[PDB]
C-alpha cells in the first residue's frame, strides 16, 4: 500500500525535476534549431511522467 | 484495468519523444561521428520503449 | 523473492550513478546558469531513485 | 507471459544502446575529466539496466 503511493510521489518528482531540465535546455538554445527541439521532446516526456505517476496512484 | 492502459499510452509518448530527439542530435552531428553514434542508439532505445508499451498494453 | 530485490539493487546503482553524473555537470558549469539548473535536476532524479528502490525492497 | 518476455528482451536492448552511448561519449572525453566521468557512469547504469532485465525474465 504506501510502497506503491512512495513510488508515485517519487515519480512526481522526476516528471518535475524532467520539466525543469527542458527549461533549462530552452533557454541553452536561446544563447539552436535542434536543440529547441530537445527541449520540447522533454517538456512531453516530463508531462507523459506525470501522467504515468498518476495511473500508479491509481493501483 | 484503465490505469494500466493509462501507463501504456504515456509510455507510447514518451518513445515518440525519445524519437524526435534521436533526430535531433542527428541534425547537430550533420552540424560528429561520436555524436551520430549517440543518436542512433537513441533511436534503437526509443524503438524498444514502444515494444514496452505494447507488452503493457497487452498485460 | 530474489527477482524483487535484485531489481531494487540495480535501481540503487542507478541512482548513485545519477549523482555521478549531476557532479560532473556541476563541474563542467563551473568551467553555465542553464547548465547548473540541469545539475541540480539531475541530483533531485537521483534522489526520487533512490527512494523508488527502497519501496520496491518494501514490496 | 509473453508480454513480460518480450518486456526483459526490450530492455537487454536499451542497456545495449545504454552502452552503446557510453562508448561514444568517451571518445567526445578523448577529443574531458568530466565528461570521461559521466561516460563512466552511463556504463555502471547499462550495466544495472541488464541486471533487471534478467530479473524480469525470472518474474
Chains 1, 2, 3, 4 share one sequence.
Do not use: G, R
Not at 531540465?21 to 535542434?34: E, L, V
Not at 536543440?35 to 495511473?55: D, P, R, S, Y
Amino acid at each position: 500500500m504506501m510502497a506503491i503511493e512512495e513510488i508515485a510521489q517519487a515519480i512526481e518528482e522526476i516528471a518535475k525535476a524532467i520539466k525543469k531540465i527542458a527549461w533549462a535546455i530552452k533557454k541553452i538554445a536561446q544563447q539552436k534549431a535542434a536543440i529547441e527541439e530537445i527541449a520540447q521532446a522533454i517538456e512531453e516526456i516530463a508531462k507523459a511522467i506525470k501522467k504515468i505517476a498518476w495511473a500508479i496512484k491509481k493501483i
